Amino acid sequence: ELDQLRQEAEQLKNQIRDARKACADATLSQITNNIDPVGRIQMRTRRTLRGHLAKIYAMHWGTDSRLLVSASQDGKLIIWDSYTTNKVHAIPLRSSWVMTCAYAPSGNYVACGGLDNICSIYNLKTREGNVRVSRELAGHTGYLSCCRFLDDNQIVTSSGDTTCALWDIETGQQTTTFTGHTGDVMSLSLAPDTRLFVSGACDASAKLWDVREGMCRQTFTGHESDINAICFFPNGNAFATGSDDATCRLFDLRADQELMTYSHDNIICGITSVSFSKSGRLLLAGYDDFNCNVWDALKADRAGVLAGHDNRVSCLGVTDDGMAVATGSWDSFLKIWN
Amino acid sequence: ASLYSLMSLIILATLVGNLIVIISISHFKQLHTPTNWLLHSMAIVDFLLGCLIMPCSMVRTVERCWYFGEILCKVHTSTDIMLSSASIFHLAFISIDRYCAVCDPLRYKAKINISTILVMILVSWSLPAVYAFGMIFLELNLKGVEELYRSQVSDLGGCSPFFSKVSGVLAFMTSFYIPGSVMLFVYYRIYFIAKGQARSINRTKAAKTLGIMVGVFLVCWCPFFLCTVLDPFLGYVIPPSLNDALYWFGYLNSALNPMVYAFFYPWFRR
Amino acid sequence: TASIAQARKLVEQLKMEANIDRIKVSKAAADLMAYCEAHAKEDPLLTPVPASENPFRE
Amino acid sequence: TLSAEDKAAVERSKMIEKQLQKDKQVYRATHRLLLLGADNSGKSTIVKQMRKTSGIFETKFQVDKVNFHMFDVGAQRDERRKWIQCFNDVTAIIFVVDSSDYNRLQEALNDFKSIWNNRWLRTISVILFLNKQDLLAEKVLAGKSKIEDYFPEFARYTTPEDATPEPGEDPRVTRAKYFIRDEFLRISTASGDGRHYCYPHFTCSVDTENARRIFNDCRDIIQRMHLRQYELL
Amino acid sequence: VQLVESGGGLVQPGGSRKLSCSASGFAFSSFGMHWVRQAPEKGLEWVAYISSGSGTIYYADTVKGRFTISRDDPKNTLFLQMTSLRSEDTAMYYCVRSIYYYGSSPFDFWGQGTTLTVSSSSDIVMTQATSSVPVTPGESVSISCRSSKSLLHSNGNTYLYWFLQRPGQSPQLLIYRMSNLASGVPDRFSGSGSGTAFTLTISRLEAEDVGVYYCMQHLEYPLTFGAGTKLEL
Ligand SMILES: NCCc1ccc(Oc2ccc(O)cc2)c(I)c1
């Protein structure tokens, strides 16, 4: 019967909550209160990229810290040269409702997808001088929301059908399927060692998954609304999330408990994207208020404002070596700060 | 003493408005639509008018004399005409753009692009350039009236522009009826359409913006152009005082142009 | 009825996550903080580099 | 740009910038529309007459040398809150209602109320289509079904004076049709503050005239938008 | 991916002929084209060049008013015009594809060549000290190249190329930008330099390494070639 199973689930949840509460020892703010603050950070716009027609939805930095790819609501993919402000490639898309884009670590392939329920792979290094599509990954029910490369033959995609999957470009089949979320998944993040990954959904919860095992290992809660973006800490034991209630949190994998909260009373809008610096000292988050706030990851103090966009910031990105930071917006303009 | 101060406020009021509109449109990337480029060009034209024509005309009206040469009177007459025609042409093209936006809703963006605004801007600066300098320097207007014209102005050392009978009619029909009828026709049609719309949506703001545009234009130009035409047809009776008076209604129109065409709109006010 | 089957799997999954090893919360505070000073000297955004070593000048 | 390779790269970038100008013109001349409905509503029949886990459908039609692009949502989950914000710049939204079943009309009114009050759907007008009108006529002449059994306010209703019953076959049919229309009309006029409008229509099984209706509605919608911006309305 | 050339023959002095190079198997409209001349018993020499957009055209200082180049994108065919042929205008001609962007590898594929026989300053000087050397099948081989000016640019690139034309076939590409290896080249060739003197190192050796190695630079676009060193096994 369903009567005893619900009580058993409730008492397991109560036991888990009690164990987590007993695990709590002290707040990170108390430990960090005896460190001098970073100060005032003042970045300025160094480059401006123009050429996009419709709204910009996503972007991804390259591993060489010089090239990047961006997606537009009109169905175009453009590869930019950050130093000389030149355009390298311009790939038209079959479907204009693209929502995400990814860049391969080796620099040989790019990926994109959207409401078409299809993830496409484009080959950049061909004998003939033209970008052509290699494979289309079909099988999802909802819309594609995020995608990240693991190597030249493995990719992880997030879809709106509340399920994640691991694909294989060589065979075009779903190697592994991840289930458990009740709401649709909006974003995912990968670890530097590519052994584990996390994702967030509209059920105000985040889960940690194992690539080979294909099973969930840990769950995080605490947000009052849906999850919009997720970023993963450089160490490999922490990650940060962003929601629509003007609130961001930091979670610890080993401690299994929420860290301090980054929020302000003057913000009523929602977070769209989050990122970390090279050393993990500064946290950058886009908002609906046309600005990009900069926070201190250790003292929870806001130090720096990145203003200059005419519409909402839809995506963010920090380069591999930390030289610069790139922002995208619905005004079809990309700005590089330093 | 009171007369000097009166004409000094007009000079200060023009440059300010035009430099504001010329900065707000070149720096702000939001207002990069093809429609705003013609407004930017018109603002540049009246800034040039205000910062060239106004000062010397002032010393002149006041000294009731022109002590700066004869290879400069001619230059002035020619640059005063040229810049008045560019402003009028810009106003006419603004009216045409408004008509195209209103009466063709589904094809406004396709027909009004940068390639048409650029053609309009060139045409407006180039057409008066080949006309004002040619009639002044080669003297298309002093034919047959040299003795009387000079007896009246050259013997007294004046610098007031002079015109003949046919040169006068040409002036009229190229710098006043041709842009004056366009505007009016467009803004009569634009009023009846708006009326029906409100009737329906409810079953007027049209009478208050359109009635102002037309009116400012016409108070500032109807008396000056007509007087000149009948001036020769009656026997040249206008006193020079009244003549400069008529003149000070073109500069007034270039002062008030931008406060009417830029600040009256929420979009830009923001 | 499939209702009991769905709840049966949910109960089994919850008990698996309950048996994990948790480290001291204050212990993870030092580990997270320690990485900051060990890499603070190689963060271009943290320490503004002069106008000669960056490629985005001018 | 001193090196020849840099000059060639600049030339390639300029070439790329010039094919992105042709696209602009084509985009500035098109109009995008969003199609919404339900399983019972014959939107598929309408879009077929106008002419795998697929995500979105696209249909193209032209009238008076004007191109319209319409997007139909394919296989998707029952939740539409998240992806509805990507259509905040379309010309209009077409809604199809099946006026033949009972309490499915109630579901249609609930869906219309939910869509109408959406925050991200502001400044967007809705075109309303009343489909399958012949079934409504055939379902009242034979009796065996009463609207009053589901809507108690049908009895306290009468045909309005401004009504124009072009067929005029039976007063009861006209009364029911105008009651059903006026329900959606009152829902639409319950709010809006004049920023957007509703254009209801009566659609038949084939009705090979909907393209002209959509063209006229779109023309009317853009003229009011332009008259509001230049303060004439 | 194959290039075919047509024309050639024996003509009287003062004649005129038109040479064509036909492309097939790739997007010919996005690659620049070069003409390279090679005397029967001498090295290579550049002739002319047309960019992808036909907005930039260069000519060799030897002949500028007698040679004309043209291209046709729709049919993917290159053209070369020669007027008033002289005695020196007798050599082998090749058409070379090239594309310029970040990370690109220009001068990657060459044509077959057509023969044409005629009856009877400030540019960087590139020289090769050696011309022939016998080696052992399995030992290391070193080839050195010299330049009269520093090839290093302010950005940080060193424009040096290695071709190694085989004795009987068209040239190939081994090293571009003095440090990067090509696609189909086995991972046994390497190159290094300091700014004025450069060396080419081959770890292993096989029977397919027999040929003449050429030296070329692309700094300020004089396009001067080297002398060439022949290897015999
Ligand atoms: N701004 C008022 C002073 C002023 C301005 C322009 C003037 O010349 C003309 C300009 C255009 C014409 O079509 C004919 C004449 C004159 I005379 C006086």
- What are the structure tokens assigned to E123, written together? 């540019």
CB contact under 8 A, A333 and B30: no
Give the minimum alpha-carbon distance from B42 to chain A in angstroms, rounded to a whole number. Answer: 26
Give the minimum alpha-carbon distance from A141 to chain D in angstroms, rounded to a whole number. Answer: 6
Distance CA E2, CA D228 (A): 62
H helical segments located in chain E:
none
CATH number, domain containing residue C13: 4.10.260.10
Q: Which residue has the tokens 């090279």?
A: A278
The residue segments making up the domain with residue C28 are 4-56
Q: Are D45 and D39 in contact (CB under 8 A)?
A: no
Domain A1-337, CATH number (from 2.40.50.180, 3.50.50.60, 2.130.10.10, 3.40.640.10): 2.130.10.10
Q: Name the A residues in 248-307 with CB < 8 Å from any C CB.
A: 252, 254-257, 277-282, 298
3-state secondary structure of E222: coil
Residues of E in contact with A86 (CB under 8 A): 101-102
Question: Backbone breaks in chain B (C–N > 2.5 Å) follow which residues?
Answer: 203
Give the minimum alpha-carbon distance from A89 to chain D in angstroms, rounded to a whole number. Answer: 8
- What are the structure tokens assigned to A181, written together? 């979320």
The conformational region for residue D65 under phi > 0 = left, psi -120 to 50 = alpha, else beta, is left
Q: Which residue has the tokens 């260069």?
A: E58
The conformational region for residue E2 under phi > 0 = left, psi -120 to 50 = alpha, else beta, is beta
Pairing of strands A109-114, A119-123: antiparallel
Q: Are B6 and B86 in contact (CB under 8 A)?
A: no
Of D25, D227, D231, the CB nearest to B102: D227
Distance CA A141, CA A162 (A): 9
H helical segments located in B139-204:
146-153, 165-175, 177-202
Q: Are B106 and D218 in contact (CB under 8 A)?
A: yes
Distance CA A306, CA A290 (A): 9
The helix-helix angle for B2-26 and B34-63 (nearest 10°) equals 160
- What are the structure tokens assigned to A61, written together? 């930095």
Structurally, chain C folds into a number of domains equal to 1
Total count of residues recorded for chain A? 338
Cα(E161) to ligand 1 centroid in Å equals 69
Distance CA D186, CA D181 (A): 9
The answer to whether domain E2-118 and domain E126-225 are alike in fold is yes
The conformational region for residue A244 under phi > 0 = left, psi -120 to 50 = alpha, else beta, is alpha
User: Could you say which DSSP state residue D190 is in?
Assistant: T
Phi, psi of B153 (to 5 degrees): -110, -35
DSSP H/E element including B232: helix B206-234
Helices and strands in chain A, H and E counts: 2, 28
DSSP H/E element including A188: strand A185-190
- What are the structure tokens assigned to B105, written together? 């809703």
CATH 2.60.40.10 fits E2-118, yes or no: yes
Distance CA B155, CA A316 (A): 77
Phi, psi of C32 (to 5 degrees): -65, -40
Q: Are A180 and A186 in contact (CB under 8 A)?
A: no
Chains E and C touch (3+ CB pairs under 8 A): no
- Residue from D58, D43, D16, D50 nearest D98 by CA: D43
Cα(B254) to ligand 1 centroid in Å equals 13
Residue list for the binding site of B: 80
Distance CA B250, CA B91 (A): 14
Taking 3-state DSSP, the helix, strand and coil percentages for chain E, each rounded to the nearest 5, stand at: 5, 45, 50
Pairing of strands A164-168, A176-178: antiparallel
The helix-helix angle for B165-175 and B206-234 (nearest 10°) equals 170
Domains of chain D: 33-229 (3.40.50.300)
Q: Are A198 and A208 in contact (CB under 8 A)?
A: yes
- The closest-lying atom of ligand 1 relative to the alpha carbon of residue B85 is 11
Domain E126-225, CATH number (from 3.40.50.920, 1.10.3720.10, 3.30.530.20, 2.60.40.10): 2.60.40.10
In single-letter form, the type of residue at position B74 comes to: K
Helices and strands in chain C, H and E counts: 2, 0
The helix-helix angle for B73-103 and B34-63 (nearest 10°) equals 150
CA gyration radius, chain D: 22
Annotate A48-104 with DSSP letters as a single string.
EE----S-EEEEEE-TTSSEEEEEETTTEEEEEETTT--EEEEEE-S-S-EEEEEE-
Q: How is chain A split into domains, by residue range? A: 1-337
Distance CA C55, CA A81 (A): 12
Distance CA A10, CA B146 (A): 110
CB contact under 8 A, D3 and E56: no
Phi, psi of B108 (to 5 degrees): -70, -45
Annotate A198-255 with DSSP letters as a single string.
EEEETTSEEEEEETTT-SEEEEEE--SS-EEEEEE-TTSSEEEEEESSSEEEEEETTT
Distance CA D186, CA D189 (A): 5
Distance CA B171, CA B190 (A): 29
- Residue from D206, D188, D209 nearest D197 by CA: D188
Sequence-ordered list of residues with C-beta below 8 angstroms from that of A314, at least 6 positions apart, any chain: A55, A56, A57, A58, A272, A273, A286, A328, A329, A330
Chains C and D touch (3+ CB pairs under 8 A): no
- The closest-lying atom of ligand 1 relative to the alpha carbon of residue B246 is 2
CB contact under 8 A, D29 and B109: yes
Q: Are D90 and D221 in contact (CB under 8 A)?
A: no
Taking 3-state DSSP, the helix, strand and coil percentages for chain C, each rounded to the nearest 5, stand at: 60, 0, 40
For a pocket test of ligand 1, which of B84, B136, B252 has the largest count of ligand atoms closer than 8 A to its C-beta?
B84
Pairing of strands A76-81, A87-92: antiparallel
Domains of chain B: 2-269 (1.20.1070.10)
Distance CA C19, CA E145 (A): 69
- What are the structure tokens assigned to D82, written together? 């998240």
In single-letter form, the type of residue at position E55 comes to: G
Question: Backbone breaks in chain A (C–N > 2.5 Å) follow which residues?
Answer: none
Rounded to the nearest angstrom, the gap between the alpha carbon of residue A5 and the centroid of all alpha carbons in its chain is 36
Q: Are E202 and E103 in contact (CB under 8 A)?
A: no
Cα(B84) to ligand 1 centroid in Å equals 6
3-state secondary structure of E200: strand
Annotate A139-185 with DSSP letters as a single string.
--SS-EEEEEEEETTEEEEEETTS-EEEEETTTT---EEE---SSPE
